[PDB]
């Protein structure tokens, strides 16, 4: 293994950051755990609500928390209802009060995470891995996407002896720092083990 994480090396440039708050040495840790505690609960909840990314901020003695989903309604519930029962517990876990916006995922086929997640959720469903990989890569090149690669790994279909197998269609310059690359991950928990999904989606540049 020897590929710099694609998202990571971009943060400074072209890629964002899924936490943005400021804190000093003291509370910096206490915050991290909080954050990784809220993204924890929330992801187990909106699991079947196609969530692709959750940002956090703590605007002075308060916690904001945006939730990038490709099923905005399902997250929000009957006229606000759900978001309430979230905010509720999300403030119970942050130790402070909690707003909680719900960003919309246009063209989810373009989100690496929601891509992987489906491929993951397809193996658990019990589907051909070559098939899923190929659906993914298509409806993607379809709705734009100057490129995409998805690879899987480990007992593909059942093998006693494990494999990787990828699919690079288009352009995916992982060495260009300008290049917009949405890179994410998801693991299938199957009856014969655990299958790792990486997906790269090449969007543009500058």
């Amino acid at each position: 293994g020897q590929k710099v994480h694609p998202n990571g090396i971009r943060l400074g440039i072209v890629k964002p950051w899924n936490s943005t708050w400021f804190a000093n040495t003291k509370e910096f840790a206490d915050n991290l755990d909080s954050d990784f505690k809220v993204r924890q609960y929330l992801t187990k909840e909106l699991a079947k609500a196609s969530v692709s990314r959750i940002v956090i901020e703590r605007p002075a003695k308060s916690i904001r928390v945006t939730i990038h989903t490709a099923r905005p309604g399902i997250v929000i519930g009957k006229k606000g209802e759900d978001v309430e029962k979230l905010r509720k517990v999300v403030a119970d876990i942050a130790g402070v009060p909690a707003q909680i916006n719900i960003a919309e995922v246009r063209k989810p086929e373009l989100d690496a995470k929601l891509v992987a997640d489906s491929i993951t959720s397809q193996l658990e469903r019990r589907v051909m891995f070559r098939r899923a990989m190929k659906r993914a890569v298509q409806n993607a090149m379809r709705l734009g996407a100057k490129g995409i690669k998805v690879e899987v790994s480990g007992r593909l279909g059942g093998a006693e002896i494990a494999r990787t197998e990828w699919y690079r269609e288009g352009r995916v310059p992982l060495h260009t720092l300008r290049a917009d690359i949405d890179y994410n991950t998801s693991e299938a928990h199957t009856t014969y083990g655990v299958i790792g999904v990486k997906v790269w989606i090449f969007k543009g540049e500058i």
């Binding site: 943005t20 708050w21 400021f22 000093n24 703590r58 605007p59 002075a60 904001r64």
Partner: protein
């Protein structure tokens, strides 16, 4: 007479709550002793990258932390309601008195 300390890890941002504050003053009361840049303290965290062994691997991260001073000389009650209530920028730490 009154100065406000600004810090945040993002730079292309802190000076846009600075130049913002500054503006929201030289418009109203004013005076304002410009925005001072000031030592950007940068920590560095250097850690081993392989789960097991390989002491030569290692990733080398840092955290820059930028400052700005402000200083406002003439404190007009309008200027004083001009910071107040017109502020924002969630990831920016601001310090009022000293």
């Amino acid at each position: 007479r009154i100065r406000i300390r600004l810090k945040a890890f993002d730079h292309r941002l802190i000076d846009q709550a600075t130049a913002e504050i500054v503006e929201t003053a030289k418009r109203t009361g004013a005076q304002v002793r410009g925005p001072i840049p000031l030592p950007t303290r940068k920590e560095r965290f250097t850690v081993l990258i392989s789960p097991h062994v390989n002491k030569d691997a290692r990733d080398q991260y840092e955290i820059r932390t930028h400052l700005r001073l402000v200083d406002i000389v003439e404190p007009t009650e309008k200027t004083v309601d001009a910071l107040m209530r017109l502020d924002l920028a969630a990831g920016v730490d601001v310090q009022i008195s000293l």
